[PDB]
Amino acid sequence: CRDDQFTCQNGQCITKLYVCDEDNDCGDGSDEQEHLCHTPEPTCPPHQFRCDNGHCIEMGTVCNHVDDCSDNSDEKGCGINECQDSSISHCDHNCTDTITSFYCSCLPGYKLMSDKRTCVDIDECKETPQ
Amino acid sequence: DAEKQIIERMFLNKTNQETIISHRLRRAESLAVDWVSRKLYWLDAILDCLFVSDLEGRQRKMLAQHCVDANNTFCFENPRGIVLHPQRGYVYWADWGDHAYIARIGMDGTNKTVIISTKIEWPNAITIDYTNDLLYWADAHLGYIEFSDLEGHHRHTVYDGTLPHPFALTIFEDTVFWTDWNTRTVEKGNKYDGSGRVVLVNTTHKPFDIHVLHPYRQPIMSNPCATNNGGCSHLCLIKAGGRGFTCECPDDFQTVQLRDRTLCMPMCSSTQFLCGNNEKCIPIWWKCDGQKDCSDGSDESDLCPHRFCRLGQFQCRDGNCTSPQALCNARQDCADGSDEDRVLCEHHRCEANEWQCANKRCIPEYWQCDSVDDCLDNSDEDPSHCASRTCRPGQFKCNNGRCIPQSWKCDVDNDCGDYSDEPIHECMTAAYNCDNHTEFSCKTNYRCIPQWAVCNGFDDCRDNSDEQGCESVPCHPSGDFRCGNHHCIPLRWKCDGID
Ligand SMILES: *[C@@H]1O[C@H](CO)[C@@H](O)[C@H](O)[C@H]1NC(C)=O
Ligand SMILES: *[C@@H]1O[C@H](CO)[C@@H](O)[C@H](O)[C@H]1NC(C)=O
Ligand SMILES: *[C@@H]1O[C@H](CO)[C@@H](O)[C@H](O)[C@H]1NC(C)=O
Ligand SMILES: *[C@@H]1O[C@H](CO)[C@@H](O)[C@H](O)[C@H]1NC(C)=O
Ligand SMILES: *[C@@H]1O[C@H](CO)[C@@H](O)[C@H](O)[C@H]1NC(C)=O
Ligand SMILES: *[C@@H]1O[C@H](CO)[C@@H](O)[C@H](O)[C@H]1NC(C)=O
Ligand SMILES: *[C@@H]1O[C@H](CO)[C@@H](O)[C@H](O)[C@H]1NC(C)=O
Ligand SMILES: *[C@@H]1O[C@H](CO)[C@H](O)[C@H](O)[C@H]1NC(C)=O
Ligand SMILES: *[C@@H]1O[C@H](CO)[C@H](O)[C@H](O)[C@H]1NC(C)=O
Ligand SMILES: [Ca+2]
Ligand SMILES: [Ca+2]
Ligand SMILES: [Ca+2]
Ligand SMILES: [Ca+2]
Ligand SMILES: [Ca+2]
Ligand SMILES: [Ca+2]
Ligand SMILES: [Ca+2]
Ligand SMILES: [Ca+2]
Ligand SMILES: [Ca+2]
Ligand SMILES: [Ca+2]
Ligand SMILES: [Ca+2]
Ligand SMILES: [Ca+2]
Ligand SMILES: [Ca+2]
Ligand SMILES: [Ca+2]
Ligand SMILES: [Ca+2]
Numbered sequence A: 001c002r003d004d005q006f007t008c009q010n011g012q013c014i015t016k017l018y019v020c021d022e023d024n025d026c027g028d029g030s031d032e033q034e035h036l037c038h039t040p041e042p043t044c045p046p047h048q049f050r051c052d053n054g055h056c057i058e059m060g061t062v063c064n065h066v067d068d069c070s071d072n073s074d075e076k077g078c079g080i081n082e083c084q085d086s087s088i089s090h091c092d093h094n095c096t097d098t099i100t101s102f103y104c105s106c107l108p109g110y111k112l113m114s115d116k117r118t119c120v121d122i123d124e125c126k127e128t129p130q
Numbered sequence B: 001d002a003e004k005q006i007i008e009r010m011f012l013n014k015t016n017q018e019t020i021i022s023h024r025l026r027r028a029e030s031l032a033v034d035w036v037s038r039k040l041y042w043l044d045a046i047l048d049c050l051f052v053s054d055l056e057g058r059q060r061k062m063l064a065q066h067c068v069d070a071n072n073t074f075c076f077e078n079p080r081g082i083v084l085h086p087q088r089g090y091v092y093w094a095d096w097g098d099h100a101y102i103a104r105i106g107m108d109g110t111n112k113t114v115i116i117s118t119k120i121e122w123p124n125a126i127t128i129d130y131t132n133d134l135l136y137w138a139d140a141h142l143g144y145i146e147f148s149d150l151e152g153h154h155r156h157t158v159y160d161g162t163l164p165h166p167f168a169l170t171i172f173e174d175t176v177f178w179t180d181w182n183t184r185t186v187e188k189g190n191k192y193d194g195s196g197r198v199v200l201v202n203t204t205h206k207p208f209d210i211h212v213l214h215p216y217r218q219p220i221m222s223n224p225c226a227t228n229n230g231g232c233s234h235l236c237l238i239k240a241g242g243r244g245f246t247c248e249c250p251d252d253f254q255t256v257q258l259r260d261r262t263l264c265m266p267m268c269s270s271t272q273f274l275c276g277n278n279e280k281c282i283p284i285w286w287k288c289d290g291q292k293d294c295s296d297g298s299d300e301s302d303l304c305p306h307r308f309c310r311l312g313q314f315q316c317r318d319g320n321c322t323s324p325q326a327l328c329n330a331r332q333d334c335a336d337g338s339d340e341d342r343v344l345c346e347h348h349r350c351e352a353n354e355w356q357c358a359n360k361r362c363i364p365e366y367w368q369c370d371s372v373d374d375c376l377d378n379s380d381e382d383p384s385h386c387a388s389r390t391c392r393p394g395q396f397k398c399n400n401g402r403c404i405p406q407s408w409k410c411d412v413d414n415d416c417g418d419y420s421d422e423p424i425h426e427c428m429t430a431a432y433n434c435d436n437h438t439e440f441s442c443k444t445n446y447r448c449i450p451q452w453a454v455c456n457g458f459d460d461c462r463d464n465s466d467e468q469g470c471e472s473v474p475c476h477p478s479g480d481f482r483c484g485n486h487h488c489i490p491l492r493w494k495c496d497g498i499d
Helices: B226-232 B383-388
Strands: A005-007 A013-015 A048-051 A055-057 A094-097 A104-105 A110-112 A119-121 B005-012 B017-021 B028-034 B039-044 B047-055 B058-063 B079-085 B088-093 B099-107 B113-118 B125-127 B134-139 B144-149 B157-158 B167-172 B176-181 B185-190 B200-201 B236-240 B245-248 B253-258 B259-264 B272-274 B282-283 B314-316 B320-322 B354-356 B363-366 B395-398 B401-404 B439-441 B448-450 B480-483 B487-490
Touching: A013 B253, B039 B079, B047 B236, B088 B125, B125 B167, B157 B185, B226 B245
Parallel strands: B028 B079, B079 B125
Antiparallel strands: A005 A013, A048 A055, A094 A104, A110 A119, B005 B017, B028 B039, B039 B047, B047 B058, B079 B088, B088 B099, B099 B113, B125 B134, B134 B144, B144 B157, B167 B176, B176 B185, B185 B200, B236 B245, B253 B259, B272 B282, B314 B320, B354 B363, B395 B401, B439 B448, B480 B487
């Protein structure tokens, strides 16, 4: 194929820009493979904080009581200890506050569920026979 | 024994040695023995089938043929390994054909099922652990040992791509033992994580199939067939699930059911002979050979001609000898012409891997419409026949009435002569993408070759892309040897007298 081109498992050469354009330019779908188009995009440095609008803030700037981010979640409830509250974080087993908002944890040997408040019990004798 | 093509039994004190099956073993790959119902199971890779018999070889039945998933996706092509579980009433085996699989069938032939179908290319070894109901298998191409639960739903790796060509596997306590062809060795490791690994011994020849001998590897359970074979007339086999039994008939008998009863009707062919007890039916040449073949002695009667010919040859009225393959092949091979007698050839039946012609001749099924007059009556390539033909499970048919393996569809070679095996508009779809664990793709065309085909010295896909970059392909750290051609070979083949 040309240097400008991309090669498909069906044996077709296509202009490289086509890749991950979501058009099925190659009927094999090699042109739109998930592992070809996926990327580690949601990241920001350890020095920083990340906000719902797609913007990242230096930890000193966070909780300055001033809008850094469109959604204001740097400030929205910053410094409040939600796990001291009861109606919010209505959670099964253990509640751990974080600098803004809360997170939840299950007891050892238990498992935590996609609602991120429910706890479950592993069937260890199928999960890990070892 | 594959050189003699026989099955033998002996006592563990070496005192007595006996041959149990000596006939119709084309390519027997593996053997299993059942201690509960007192049975012998084995696999054949030329008839592409699974057989059951009694420990003395007095009766035989064929329990599986064709395809295991009803979809025809997998099918008996290279069945290598076998293992038994009586408490669940299951027989497990593995196949290393184009579509490798592990499948289980019930000891009476029921509930044919596929257990493993992915990340599997050369499953030479299969075993079961009865202490916790686990199934272990080894792959020689992917170089792994894996274990699952008997349904196949959870998978774990003892070794994850570090074993060069294992062949056989066995388990005891926290330890697993396996045989390795490429380093010609026997090794033991820990069955959950592969820890604590050592080479027990190394050999000059190929190690082949390993077992652990101790009572607990054949656990105790009650035999459902114990009382008078459960009333069965010929064969009694454990039902799927392990509770209860099923009565069945040998392979040249018809099974039928009646009120609280089962019946076996002998339906065996010309060129075969039936015994008075309705026990078995045997080849005609056996009928009078000096060896009692029926248990009742019904064949080797005194009212017989003189046996001029050697044991196993076929004898003509003149007192002349011909190989049994001569019999009913549509050409006269014996002076009498008894070789082609109407009485013998009418109601004659061929082997399971053959097709029959109007002149009562047998040819391999692949010859059936190969555009050659393999049958002198031309009955194989009758255009009406090749047009009306329906081909057996797991292969694909073409407009010219010719059939080829399903794998041969959608690749680069016009296997049917006509290009009907490669409809381009179908082949270029996502349905034919190469398996990302076991296959390699060639940049110029829509053909997949197995990963072992790459850098083997051959143009396996017609753009030669599989042999270009071989300086970059490393050999396996142990078990392989490297050649100045930038090729890797098994280390068993170094210093073997062949190029
Ligand atoms: C919650 O966390 C505390 C931590 O000390 C622990 O003692 C407790 O058992 C956990 N679960 C519940 C239900 O409180
Ligand atoms: C060799 O096999 C015999 C049985 O045939 C067994 O009794 C013996 O223990 C084996 N050898 C060793 C060293 O265990
Ligand atoms: C059989 O294979 C076809 C084609 O891949 C597929 O659509 C179908 O779901 C498979 N299974 C059955 C049970 O038909
Ligand atoms: C077999 O193993 C022994 C002990 O590890 C070793 O000394 C010997 O060289 C090995 N022989 C072969 C042919 O691998
Ligand atoms: C038959 O096999 C299926 C899985 O393929 C299983 O769900 C079922 O319980 C089996 N039945 C018997 C009687 O073995
Ligand atoms: C065997 O065949 C030959 C054919 O030339 C014939 O002469 C002979 O009679 C046959 N054998 C006997 C014992 O008759
Ligand atoms: C093969 O593809 C599957 C996704 O379909 C992926 O989970 C797996 O990791 C891939 N394996 C290899 C060896 O690339
Ligand atoms: C990968 O990241 C890029 C930006 O770097 C795009 O956001 C792209 O959409 C991402 N891929 C997926 C599948 O989310
Ligand atoms: C994303 O951010 C984290 C820290 O929050 C790490 O630095 C990680 O390495 C980043 N992701 C990538 C892809 O570099
Ligand atoms: Ca595209
Ligand atoms: Ca486009
Ligand atoms: Ca702020
Ligand atoms: Ca908080
Ligand atoms: Ca075969
Ligand atoms: Ca394969
Ligand atoms: Ca005889
Ligand atoms: Ca003949
Ligand atoms: Ca031919
Ligand atoms: Ca032919
Ligand atoms: Ca081919
Ligand atoms: Ca082809
Ligand atoms: Ca090659
Ligand atoms: Ca060789
Ligand atoms: Ca050599």
